[PDB]
Amino acid sequence: SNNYCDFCLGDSKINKKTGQPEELVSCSDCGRSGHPSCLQFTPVMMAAVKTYRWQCIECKCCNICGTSENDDQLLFCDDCDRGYHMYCLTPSMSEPPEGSWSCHLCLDLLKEKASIYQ
Ligand SMILES: [Zn+2]
Ligand SMILES: [Zn+2]
Ligand SMILES: [Zn+2]
Ligand SMILES: [Zn+2]
C-alpha cells in the first residue's frame, strides 16, 4: 500500500491538511491511501473503514457476490462504504433507496449510530 495520502500528500505522521497525525486507510486492492478525514468520512465511517479490507471506489466489489459489475446498481453503505448490489440484497431492491442507507452489518454493529436513524 501507499505510505502517502492521495489527497494531501501527507503521512501517517502528518495530515498536511489538519496538521495532526492520522492513520492512513489503504485500498486493499490497488494500494492507494488516504486519511479518513481527507476521504471526508464521518467519524463513524472513519472508524468502520478500519474493521475490514476497505476498497477504493475504483476497486469496490459487492460484499455479497464479490463482482464489480452493474455499477449502476451497486449501493454504497453510508456507514462502512462497502458495496452491495440492489439485486443481491434481500429482498431485492427495484429502486435505489432514498436518503441515507445503512447495511445489515452496520445496523448490527453501530446500532443507533447508523446513518439510517435520527
Ligand atoms: Zn491526507
Ligand atoms: Zn483501489
Ligand atoms: Zn452483488
Ligand atoms: Zn455498512
Swiss-Prot record:
| Subcellular locations according to the entry | Nucleus; Cytoplasm
The gene is: DPF2
Q: Which disease is it linked to?
A: Coffin-Siris syndrome 7: A form of Coffin-Siris syndrome, a congenital multiple malformation syndrome with broad phenotypic and genetic variability. Cardinal features are intellectual disability, coarse facial features, hypertrichosis, and hypoplastic or absent fifth digit nails or phalanges. Additional features include malformations of the cardiac, gastrointestinal, genitourinary, and/or central nervous systems. Sucking/feeding difficulties, poor growth, ophthalmologic abnormalities, hearing impairment, and spinal anomalies are common findings.
Give the PHD-type zinc finger regions.
Answer: 2-62, 59-109
What quaternary structure, including any partners, is listed in this protein's UniProt entry? Interacts with the nucleosomes, in particular nucleosomes bearing histone H3 crotonylated at 'Lys-14' (H3K14cr) for which DPF2 has high affinity. Also interacts (via PHD-type zinc finger domains) with histone H3 butyrylated at 'Lys-14' (H3K14bu), histone H3 propionylated at 'Lys-14' (H3K14pr), and histone H3 acetylated at 'Lys-14' (H3K14ac). Interacts with histone H3 acetylated at 'Lys-9' (H3K9ac), histone H3 di-methylated at 'Lys-9' (H3K9me2), and histone H3 tri-methylated at 'Lys-9' (H3K9me3). Interacts with histone H4 acetylated at 'Lys-12' (H4K12ac).
Phosphoserine (modified residue): where?
S12
Known role: Plays an active role in transcriptional regulation by binding modified histones H3 and H4. Is a negative regulator of myeloid differentiation of hematopoietic progenitor cells. Might also have a role in the development and maturation of lymphoid cells. Involved in the regulation of non-canonical NF-kappa-B pathway.
What does the record say mutating R82H does? Answer: In CSS7; abolishes interaction with acetylated histone H3; strongly decreased interaction with methylated histone H3
**Which location does the Swiss-Prot or TrEMBL entry give for the cross-link Glycyl lysine isopeptide (Lys-Gly) (interchain with G-Cter in SUMO2)?**
K13
Q: What is this protein called?
A: Zinc finger protein ubi-d4
What broad taxonomic lineage does this protein's source fall under?
A: Eukaryota, Metazoa, Chordata, Craniata, Vertebrata
Q: In which tissues is it expressed?
A: Ubiquitous.
Q: Which domain of life does this protein belong to? A: Eukaryota
Protein family according to the UniProt entry: Belongs to the requiem/DPF family.
